[PDB]
RNA sequence: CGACUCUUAGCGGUGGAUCACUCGGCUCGUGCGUCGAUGAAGAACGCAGCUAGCUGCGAGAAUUAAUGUGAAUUGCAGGACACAUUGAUCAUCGACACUUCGAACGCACUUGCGGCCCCGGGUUCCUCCCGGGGCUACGCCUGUCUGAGCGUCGCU
RNA sequence: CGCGACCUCAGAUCAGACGUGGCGACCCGCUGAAUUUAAGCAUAUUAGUCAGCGGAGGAAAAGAAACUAACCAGGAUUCCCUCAGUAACGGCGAGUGAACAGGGAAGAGCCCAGCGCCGAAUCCCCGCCCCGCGGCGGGGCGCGGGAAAUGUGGCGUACGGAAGACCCACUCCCCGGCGCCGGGGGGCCCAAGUCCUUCUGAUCGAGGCCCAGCCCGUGGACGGUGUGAGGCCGGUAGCGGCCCCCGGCGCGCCGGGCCCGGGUCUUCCCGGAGUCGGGUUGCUUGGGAAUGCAGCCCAAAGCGGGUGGUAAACUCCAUCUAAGGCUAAAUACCGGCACGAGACCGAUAGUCAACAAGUACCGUAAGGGAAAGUUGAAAAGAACUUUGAAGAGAGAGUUCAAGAGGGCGUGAAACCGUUAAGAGGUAAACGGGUGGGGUCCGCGCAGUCCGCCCGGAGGAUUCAACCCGGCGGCGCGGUCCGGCCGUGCCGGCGGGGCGGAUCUCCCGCUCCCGUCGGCGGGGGACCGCCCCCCGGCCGGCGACCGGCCGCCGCCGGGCGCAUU
RNA sequence: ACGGACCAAGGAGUCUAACACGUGCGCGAGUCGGGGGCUACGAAAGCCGCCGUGGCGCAAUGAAGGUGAAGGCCGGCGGCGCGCCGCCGGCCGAGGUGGGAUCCCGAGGCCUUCCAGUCCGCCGAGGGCGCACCACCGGCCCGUCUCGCCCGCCGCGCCGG
RNA sequence: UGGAAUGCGAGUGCCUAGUGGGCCACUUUUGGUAAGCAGAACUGGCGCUGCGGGAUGAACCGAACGCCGGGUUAAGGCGCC
RNA sequence: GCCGUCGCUGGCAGUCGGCAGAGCGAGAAAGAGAGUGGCGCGGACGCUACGCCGCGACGAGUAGGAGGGCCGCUGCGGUGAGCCUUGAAGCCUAGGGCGCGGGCCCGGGUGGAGCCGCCGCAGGUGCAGAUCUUGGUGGUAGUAGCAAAUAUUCAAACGAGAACUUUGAAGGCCGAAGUGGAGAAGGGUUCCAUGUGAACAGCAGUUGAACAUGGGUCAGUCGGUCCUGAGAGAUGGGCGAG
């Protein structure tokens, strides 16, 4: 029965909720297995970047949010072609590569171009045979003081 | 304190797997420290009581300065039984009083080919912890 | 909490009326002493306790920052007061300076007979001491759930860098190390009451400033807080109630009793 | 005064509350996260010097081998054990073994009937009879083997 | 008639494999209610839930868009916060109820058929050789047998790809050992009081242990030990030690593989049908002129097809490319093994079950299903004497205690027996008021002390006042010296740090010819605050003082010889 | 009228979500890390600001398309016929009335032998600014109706104001 | 001269339990022969409330309650109980 | 007179002391105000201001509401240099008291190991009932009753013990559709022997189908085994999400 002056609320408790009750004991248990594994992971990796691959500069849809500027998901072959890396080699140097993406703008496609830049100037690279250097490969001055970064690699900033 | 997250402070456990250790655990359980004239000989504190050793009851109605020989360890008790630690029954005949081996010094050991193992074994290993902290 | 299934792992239904037997359900037949004699409610023997305790109680609280912090200020406000500490309990009759500093060496002790000589020389050893005369065992089923032994609290020891002072202390009975990056609450103001002893390293009386930081210069360690403010300066209303200013503007005191 | 009855106190009985203990539960969290025709889970029946139940095990039956340990097990007997030409007791457990029913598998479920092959007594290959061992369930895949068709053909 | 193929189909205890059943907390596929709510009830709700059936794994499922969007666009799946109690559904009642975007945890892609190209360039099986051999493989032989042209392998898959030519670039990549190079499990061990007196039945209790403040402490968690133990024992701490096994990450060597890429032109090729889709029916969904799924009928196309949340026609645009397949991580877990913990319960509680408990017991069965912990430190568990047939007693003894005597800690209440005291014909009991008697208490029974003063008899190493030393209070010491601070105030040929949506030499990269403009980056200038040195005052030191000076008080040491 | 022979132990407004008001606390036009991340008791505590996404608050109104919260006086110009209308350049500026705690001014006065005579206070006739709040009247924003006349320009219009 | 008397500090705002079976009496009063009946109006009670009286008593007369000493009353009483 | 509530939105920081001067109860708005000229070293209590003090009026109460509990229960963080084997909890008590009460504190006894005061924190926190639940115990009550089927008696034995056991002698019953002698189903050791007298056999037992010790069921021909009956039930096939 209702009170003299009050809300109609309906409350969503006519099924049995009781059984489908998900408590958050193990929030604390399961925050230190994500930061066990992943120095586990960074530990794995020895000096590549521990955020993982670069991701490119991304705006949005949604006028409500087409102003802010993102971390989308990989670099359109376009870009890629512009930079001058083939996509089947760009996944093993860091670089986030989906297909999925169009490029309709130029003034996001040069960004990104010059965000590939940008990382393949900052990128030290380990010659493949030890023992041996290669072409297009740091020289042992760089890869004595090549360490691991941290946090984002190439953060996005508004 | 105790930091190792695997050994328990639990109360009932360890006094559960006090009372349910097997008797190879219970004989260590069953250790007795050394007389002052062993330990400044051997650097030994304590040792798990066998049965042919000479000791002396410190703690109880029967302490005192007689040394006996430990007749049996009767290990599912907890308890040993001694050369002249003993009572009478009603009727006459005579029993022995069990001692436990925490109230209890040793005064002579019975060297084995084993015990020896045991003596260097603590040795070694103090004064490898002698070296750890000096 | 206790199981959900408990009192409700049998099948009973009540007889109903009639029978001259109080309605209650009752266990089904069998040739056995709970045969017929009152399953669930909590009025019977055996049954489910009324409103069995779940596990989704609200068990934790959570503080607005601002207010653990205006508490960590009030609980260090508090500790430079030698009667809100000698009021907590503690033996400091002889401490020579209640914001107790000391050099930094003292975080390079590694052995405890160090920070015992340190205990004595500043004549903080009366509060282990008075440790050692507090330690008793418990009273009530708290022995038998791991709670076995009690003991008072003893000084709190504020450090920066941990060179092995926790190591050194941490076996002396009472003695509680802390962090200045990390000051908890629940340490420096043990029971909910303010004025504990407090000893500190310079390096960490050093810090005070950058963490929380004076009224007008910002707390430079934290984003945005600057220290609380004061709803009254002069706090001596008694140097205020006697004072020309107010004294003069005050009537005659009519204290005759009719 | 006496009996009986009532009340209070003393002690004594019936009963086992209260308190004090706790090798038990409940809940939370962590790590792993593994059964079976190479016979699972479960059931049945057996095994101890003295043994009913629990527990352990399976005719090698309160356990075998191995390794670690290093002198007991114990309720009483008895029995091992230079403690080193050698190892009591526990724990571990990787070798071996592991009765019948059970997906349970020759046919049935009484414990009844078989068929085949190879051994030992019987015989002296004379099949008989007895004992021992190995096989003989249903579907299904790859290939092998033998076959069916006035199915489609080719040659005789 | 026979012979030999191929197709289709049988038979084997044929050679070699595979499945079956159990568990089921979590997960996948179906089936699927009614209690209840609506104050009735029928649609709705409960609910795609309970029950039922099938199938798995340590996770499963999903998964690299026939997607979201309408932006300046995002880009596999799963998960959390938020969107959101929202849009929407609904006797528009009860009630029900998503998604997009955004911030996070995690992060990874791929593979076929088809279309073509290649001498089927491919695969399985048996026999023999050598090795490897406890996850059945590597290499060699076999005019050895099969599968397969009704299509095996390599390249290749929508992000385009293939082929010829031009160019440049270019030798590790993988597996298998042989052999050596420094995380997990298991076994063993590593500090210090039984130190002196004293309680007890027994100490782990109480006091002491100088000036090494009894000893150790990286060990003062806990458990045991005749109450209560850092130092008696096991343990605890420790990037402490010793010894076994497993594995990874490593480096050489052998025998194998694999004979390889990108860029610009040129010629070519490019896709999944009783499927989509439409009608209609039933269920489901927030999905409303049908969100999804399914049955039946019709039944496609290829500049085609689907989607763009109102049915239809026209025309534009956006968006993917369905009808084939695989894919870890983030995620779930009241079952299993092994663990740790707790402001939980403490034997009528907590699991039904602390115990020979899913046992005893009941039911023909499906099923139902308890009650039941505690002698004592140790059995030291009462020898022996004695009556009685025995149970039972009376002595005696054990124990600190039998006032603990084998269901024995403590041993309440109801109920009963006996002893003591009183009482008694309106059932008993009760409240108010007294009296009588009892029981103990007051440790009652000659009754309070305290201050001053007066006198009366005695005893001090004693009063006042001075001197020395120390200490403390106060000081408008009008305004003494020197400090310190100010949620004080101004100045400065001052240094510095934070911030700024206040302005402006080199550098990244960009369009136009090293000239020339836009912008990605640190200076620099400037503004505010703060900090630190500089001078000035102001004012505090009562949340924050030091020396000399003065006054006062106190203590101690003198001096006082006693009408104090 | 119903339950009750006696005694022991057990035994009944609990927890979660939502909402409303009241109350204490911190910050305050802001507020909060709850999700995520970084650093024995501790599964705690601390921290993040280029983690404040997002929630709630700061704007309402309309079903919607949408719109979205004082004005006055002054000249100068055009128009109507002394006012108004529009149009440029000035200054003034966020209503008013009534009640209204509080505060402010103060005629006069608060004694000591007698008058003048200043400072400090206090009382006080009367007069004021008026907190919060209440009543009333105006004003402002959105929807809607009625009557009207004008201004705008890349698109002069079933346009916009 | 705050425009009759007497008395008394008022005004306002949220949140809110219980209740929503009533009954009796004086007076008026409807149905009914009437009823300790059914149904209304005004006020007071019982319910929710003891105490003295009416022998007894929900409602009648007096009178309303903290625990006590003295005094005096109400309504009722004063042969004995 | 005492207790309490309400109101006075009452009074008290003035304990202002040889740096002193001890007052604001009195009918009448406001200063025991400033300046400007004519010896003996002495003086109770108070004030946890959430405290203390003074005045009046008041004091019912179901349903209901609110407050205050130095009322009580169990655990948690602090704190009592807390209590305790020279005796804690618990329980009993014709002992002494406190508080209006919830309740509490002492003394004596029993007992044998833990327990409490305060400030906060938390809750499965207070019982007279619910034909409440579980356990224990009463009056009824030494009462009802130990009454279906005719019947017992004498002597002896064993034995502590005899209406009930055993023997013998009498008298009786069942009266071959039996109270006889054997089997099926079912029971499962009840069979047989010796001993025991705790419990049971609704009195007693020297006895038992009780208890404790040990024994015992022998097949080519007796049955099962085999065959089919009513019927049950695979494969093939069909149906079926399964
Ligand atoms: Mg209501
Ligand atoms: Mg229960
Ligand atoms: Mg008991
Ligand atoms: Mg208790
Ligand atoms: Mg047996
Ligand atoms: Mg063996
Ligand atoms: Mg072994
Ligand atoms: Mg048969
Ligand atoms: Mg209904
Ligand atoms: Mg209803
Ligand atoms: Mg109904
Ligand atoms: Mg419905
Ligand atoms: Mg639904
Ligand atoms: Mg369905
Ligand atoms: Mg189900
Ligand atoms: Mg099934
Ligand atoms: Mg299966
Ligand atoms: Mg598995
Ligand atoms: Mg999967
Ligand atoms: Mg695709
Ligand atoms: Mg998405
Ligand atoms: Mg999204
Ligand atoms: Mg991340
Ligand atoms: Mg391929
Ligand atoms: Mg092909
Ligand atoms: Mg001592
Ligand atoms: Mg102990
Ligand atoms: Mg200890
Ligand atoms: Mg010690
Ligand atoms: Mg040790
Ligand atoms: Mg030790
Ligand atoms: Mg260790
Ligand atoms: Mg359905
Ligand atoms: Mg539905
Ligand atoms: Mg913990
Ligand atoms: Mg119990
Ligand atoms: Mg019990
Ligand atoms: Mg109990
Ligand atoms: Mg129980
Ligand atoms: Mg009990
Ligand atoms: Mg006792
Ligand atoms: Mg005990
Ligand atoms: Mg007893
Ligand atoms: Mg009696
Ligand atoms: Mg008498
Ligand atoms: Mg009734
Ligand atoms: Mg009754
Ligand atoms: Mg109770
Ligand atoms: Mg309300
Ligand atoms: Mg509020
Ligand atoms: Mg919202
Ligand atoms: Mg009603
Ligand atoms: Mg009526
Ligand atoms: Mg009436
Ligand atoms: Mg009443
Ligand atoms: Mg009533
Ligand atoms: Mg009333
Ligand atoms: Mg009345
Ligand atoms: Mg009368
Ligand atoms: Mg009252
Ligand atoms: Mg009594
Ligand atoms: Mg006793
Ligand atoms: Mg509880
Ligand atoms: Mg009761
Ligand atoms: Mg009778
Ligand atoms: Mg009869
Ligand atoms: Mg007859
Ligand atoms: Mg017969
Ligand atoms: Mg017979
Ligand atoms: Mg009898
Ligand atoms: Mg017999
Ligand atoms: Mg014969």
Not at chain 1, 110 to 136: D, H, I, M, T
Not at chain 3, 129 to 149: D, L
Request: with cysteine.
């Amino acid at each position: 029965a209702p009170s003299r002056n009050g809300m109609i609320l309906k409350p969503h408790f006519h099924k049995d909720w009781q059984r489908r009750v998900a408590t958050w004991f193990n929030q604390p248990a399961r925050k230190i297995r994500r930061r066990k594994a992943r120095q586990a992971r960074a530990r794995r990796i020895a000096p590549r970047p521990a955020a993982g691959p670069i991701r490119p500069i991304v705006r949005c849809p949604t006028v409500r949010y087409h102003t802010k500027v993102r971390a989308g998901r990989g670099f359109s072959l376009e870009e890629l072609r512009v930079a001058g890396i083939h996509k089947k080699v760009a996944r093993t140097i860091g670089i986030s590569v989906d297909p999925r993406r169009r490029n309709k703008s130029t003034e996001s496609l040069q960004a990104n171009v010059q965000r590939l830049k940008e990382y393949r100037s900052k990128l030290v690279l380990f010659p493949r045979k030890p023992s041996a250097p290669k072409k297009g490969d740091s020289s042992a001055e760089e890869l004595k003081l090549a360490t691991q970064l941290t946090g984002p690699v190439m953060p996005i900033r508004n | 304190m105790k930091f190792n997250p695997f050994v328990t402070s639990d109360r009932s456990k360890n006094r559960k797997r006090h009372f349910n250790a097997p008797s190879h655990i219970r004989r260590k359980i069953m250790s007795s420290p050394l007389s002052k004239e062993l330990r400044q000989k051997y650097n030994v504190r304590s040792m798990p009581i066998r049965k042919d050793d000479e000791v002396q009851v410190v703690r109880g109605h029967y302490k005192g300065q007689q040394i006996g020989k430990v007749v049996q360890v009767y290990r599912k008790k907890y308890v040993i039984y001694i050369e002249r630690v003993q009572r009478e029954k009603a009727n006459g005949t005579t029993v022995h009083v069990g001692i436990h081996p925490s109230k209890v010094v040793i005064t002579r050991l019975k060297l084995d080919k084993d015990r020896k193992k045991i003596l260097e074994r603590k040795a070694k290993s103090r004064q490898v912890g002698k070296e750890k902290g000096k | 909490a206790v199981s959900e299934l408990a009192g409700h792992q049998t099948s009973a239904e009540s007889w109903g009326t009639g029978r001259a037997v109080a309605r209650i359900p009752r266990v089904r037949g069998g040739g056995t002493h709970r045969s017929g004699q009152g399953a669930f409610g909590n009025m019977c023997r055996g049954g489910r306790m009324f409103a069995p305790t779940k596990t989704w109680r609200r068990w934790h609280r959570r503080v607005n920052t601002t207010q653990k912090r205006y508490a960590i200020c009030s609980a260090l406000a508090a500790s430079a007061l030698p009667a809100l500490v000698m009021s907590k309990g503690h033996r400091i009759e002889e401490v020579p300076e209640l914001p107790l500093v000391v050099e930094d060496k003292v975080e390079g002790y590694k052995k405890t007979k160090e920070a015992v000589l340190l205990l004595k020389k500043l004549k903080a050893w009366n509060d282990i001491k008075k440790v050692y005369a507090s330690q008793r065992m418990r009273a009530g089923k708290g022995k038998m759930r791991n709670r076995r032994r009690i003991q008072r609290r003893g000084p709190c020891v504020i450090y920066n860098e941990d060179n092995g002072i926790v190591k050194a202390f941490r076996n002396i009975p009472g003695i509680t190390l802390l962090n200045v990056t990390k000051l908890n609450i629940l340490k420096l103001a043990p029971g909910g009451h303010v004025g504990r002893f407090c000893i500190w390293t310079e390096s960490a009386f050093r810090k005070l400033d950058d963490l929380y930081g004076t009224w007008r210069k910002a707390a430079s360690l934290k984003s945005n807080y600057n220290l609380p403010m004061h709803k009254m300066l002069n706090t001596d209303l008694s140097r205020i109630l006697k004072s020309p200013e107010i004294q003069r503007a005050l009537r005659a005191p009519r204290k005759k009793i009719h």
